[PDB]
Amino acid sequence: RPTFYRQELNKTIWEVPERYQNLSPVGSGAYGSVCAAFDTKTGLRVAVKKLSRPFQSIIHAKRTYRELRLLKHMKHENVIGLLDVFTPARSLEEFNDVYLVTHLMGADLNNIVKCQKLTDDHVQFLIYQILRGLKYIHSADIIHRDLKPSNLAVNEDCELKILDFGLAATRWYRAPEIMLNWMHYNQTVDIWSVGCIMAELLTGRTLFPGTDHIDQLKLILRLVGTPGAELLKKISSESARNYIQSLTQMPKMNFANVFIGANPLAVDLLEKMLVLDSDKRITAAQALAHAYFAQYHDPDDEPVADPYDQSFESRDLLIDEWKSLTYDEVISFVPPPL
Ligand SMILES: CN1CCC(c2cc(-c3ccncc3)c(-c3ccc4ccccc4c3)nn2)CC1
Numbered sequence: 001r002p003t004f005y006r007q008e009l010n011k012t013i014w015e016v017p018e019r020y021q022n023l024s025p026v027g028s029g030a031y032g033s034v035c036a037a038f039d040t041k042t043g044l045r046v047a048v049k050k051l052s053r054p055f056q057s058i059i060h061a062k063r064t065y066r067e068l069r070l071l072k073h074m075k076h077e078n079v080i081g082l083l084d085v086f087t088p089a090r091s092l093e094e095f096n097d098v099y100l101v102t103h104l105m106g107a108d109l110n111n112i113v114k115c116q117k118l119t120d121d122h123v124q125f126l127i128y129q130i131l132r133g134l135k136y137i138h139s140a141d142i143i144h145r146d147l148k149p150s151n152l153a154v155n156e157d158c159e160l161k162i163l164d165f166g167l168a169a170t171r172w173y174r175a176p177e178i179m180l181n182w183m184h185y186n187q188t189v190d191i192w193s194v195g196c197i198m199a200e201l202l203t204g205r206t207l208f209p210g211t212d213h214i215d216q217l218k219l220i221l222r223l224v225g226t227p228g229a230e231l232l233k234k235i236s237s238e239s240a241r242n243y244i245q246s247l248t249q250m251p252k253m254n255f256a257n258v259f260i261g262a263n264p265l266a267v268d269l270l271e272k273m274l275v276l277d278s279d280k281r282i283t284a285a286q287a288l289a290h291a292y293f294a295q296y297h298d299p300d301d302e303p304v305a306d307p308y309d310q311s312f313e314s315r316d317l318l319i320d321e322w323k324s325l326t327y328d329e330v331i332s333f334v335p336p337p338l
């Protein structure tokens with residue numbers, strides 16, 4: 001066991017191993033607070049997240065377990081990963097706090113797109129890295145479900161990592177089937193989000209800046225058109241099908257006119273991501289092979305993930321049992337090779 005030390009940062013107590021020095025508050029990001037720090041063992045700048053109230057309710061205890069299980073499984077250059085996870089507790093009896101450690105990332109995609117316009121070459125590289133991480137995530141049967149610019153961490157090398165995967169105006173990046181509350185949406189919802197992000201990087205403008213869920217769907221249908229007969233056959237909900245058919249029909253717009261002046265390969269890919277029928281949307285693996293990424297695509301360096309057991313999601317357990325399971329996962333953590 002290492003030696004811990006205690007301090008207060010922004011009305012919050014931080015107790016960390018002495019290997020982490022020079023903690024500076026970076027902001028209350030996520031179900032937790034984040035501090036930048038200097039890792040004396042490696043010489044690298046790290047981000048340390050302290051979870052808030054991790055075992056206060058069954059909801060929190062399960063979510064804490066879910067996030068730790070998820071972060072421990074991900075080992076990919078374009079997905080946020082765990083350098084370390086620790087607790088100051090010496091036993092389960094006094095186990096009450098969980099701290100997570102990853103490499104410090106300088107900014108998010110929202111900070112970049114707002115502060116500067118991006119050339120087509122940067123768009124290629126950024127979207128390529130999103131899709132490469134997504135191929136990995138999806139191969140483990142994990143859906144992100146909330147991809148957006150602020151969940152994409154980026155540093156000055158333009159290296160990118162996906163944050164907050166698999167966890168839990170209205171969402172401008174959410175797939176339309178979600179706005180319609182379809183309960184059997186699948187991993188292609190993330191491809192829709194990537195299309196919206198890509199469009200924004202190319203134009204500098206939010207593609208679908210809806211004011212609420214109804215307006216969000218309206219804006220979407222204005223660009224991609226109202227559902228065709230093939231898609232209508234797949235809608236079981238009677239209220240939804242009746243609503244969709246009651247709308248005045250909208251034609252699909254030509255993306256080459258909407259994104260005039262963009263690389264026509266970029267436009268072709270957007271067409272393939274922003275398809276209304278989720279069954280016809282391009283997958284992450286397929287998108288990586290698209291000619292738009294010809295200068296980065298390497299089929300021998302686009303790996304998939306090990307199998308990921310999500311069976312715990314269907315279990316009904318006590319707080320103390322979720323806490324014990326989380327404790328087990330803290331103690332069994334093995335840091336990645338230096
Ligand atoms: C709109 N917000 C979108 C979310 C965002 C954010 C940044 C960070 C973050 C990540 C990396 N380098 C700086 C900040 C984190 C975060 C921090 C530490 C971690 C340690 C282990 C595992 C995961 C971790 C996630 N989590 N969330 C804040 C802004």
Ligand SMILES: Fc1ccc(-c2n[nH]cc2-c2ccncc2)cc1
Binds near residue numbers: 180181242
């Ligand atoms: F997600 C949904 C669910 C139901 C509806 C709906 N069905 N019939 C009428 C509506 C409707 C129309 C306008 N604003 C809200 C709801 C619209 C969207």
Ligand SMILES: Fc1ccc(-c2n[nH]cc2-c2ccncc2)cc1
Binds near residue numbers: 227244
């Ligand atoms: F208006 C729309 C917009 C999107 C969809 C849709 N796209 N992919 C899957 C669906 C879908 C939506 C609701 N129920 C089943 C399937 C269906 C109707």
